[PDB]
Design a protein around this ligand. Structure first.
Ligand code: HEC
Ligand SMILES: [Zn+2]
Ligand SMILES: [Zn+2]
Length: 249
């Protein structure tokens, strides 16, 4: 969740440009963002974000059962830019943009970094951010010019928790090489795979409900080999765009 990015990373964009959601949402999927080519100072414009996925495909949920996906994103605007206050949103636009409550600043001193979600993916095919450009004439920290906007967008449950533990929406691997002597399947959906190592020892790898086993009893497996499919059907992607903070006329 966006909140887990806030708790663990003061800066959501690493030196390489990689956005921190990627540290836990391991699969890559597209991220789209559309903004006007240029905007006048102290003006409101729309930033349209899309996070594609096949709405007919369900994902493994926290309880292991199949369900819908939720989406979320971090939109990094240039210095001075912020989500537009409601009273600054023009009339014809108010019904074209997301409601104010959808948007959360990354931090008090990073209001140009906007977070949205989790939101139900089936209801938000486009997330439209109403953005207020700054005014260089009265704000010395910002100047007219061309700037970059960075988008990080996710759909679906991540693979690793803030605790460092893997979620049930990930591949589980053989903790050691050997032969599978048994597969204890709880009607809980979870499982325990007993592996007989090449010299007597037997180890047990626990797998939560959700992932599908792709090994069978009596089967040999290498260390690190996959015991399950990769049930993940979502992903996180990034996209950059530019915008010109323009001088009137
Ligand atoms: C690891 C510490 C994470 C970071 C950093 C971020 N997210 Fe995450 N997110 C993570 C997990 C393990 C889960 C699943 C929780 C569960 O058990 O259900 C999530 C979930 C989301 C969701 C909901 C997806 C869905 O339910 O379909 C969204 C929309 C989401 N996360 C977005 C997101 C963004 C945009 C992040 C970076 C700004 C981000 N997450 C960071 C793990 C972690
Ligand atoms: Zn869609
Ligand atoms: Zn930048």
């Amino acid at each position: 969740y966006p909140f887990w990015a806030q708790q663990n990373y003061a800066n959501p964009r690493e030196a390489t440009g990689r956005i921190v959601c990627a540290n836990c949402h391991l699969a890559a999927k597209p991220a789209e963002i559309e903004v006007p080519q240029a905007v006048l100072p102290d003006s409101v414009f729309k930033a349209v974000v899309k996070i594609p996925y096949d709405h007919s495909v369900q994902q493994v949920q926290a309880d292991g059962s199949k369900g819908p996906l939720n989406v979320g994103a971090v939109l990094m605007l240039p210095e001075g830019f912020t989500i537009a206050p409601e009273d600054r949103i023009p009339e014809e636009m108010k019904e074209e943009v997301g409601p104010s409550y959808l948007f959360q600043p990354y931090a008090d001193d990073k209001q140009n970094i906007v977070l949205v979600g989790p939101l139900p993916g089936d209801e938000y095919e486009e997330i439209v951010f109403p953005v207020l450009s700054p005014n260089p004439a009265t704000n010395k920290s910002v100047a007219f010019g061309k700037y970059s906007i960075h988008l990080g967008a996710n759909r679906g449950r991540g693979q690793i928790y803030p605790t460092g533990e893997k979620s049930n929406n990930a591949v589980y691997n053989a903790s050691a090489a050997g032969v599978i002597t048994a597969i204890a399947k709880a009607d809980d959906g979870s499982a325990e795979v007993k592996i007989r190592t090449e010299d007597g020892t037997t180890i047990v790898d626990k797998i939560p409900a959700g992932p599908e086993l792709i090994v069978s009893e009596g089967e040999e497996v290498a260390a690190g080999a996959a015991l399950t499919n990769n049930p993940n059907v979502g992903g996180f992607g990034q996209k950059d765009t530019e915008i010109v903070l323009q001088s009137p006329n």
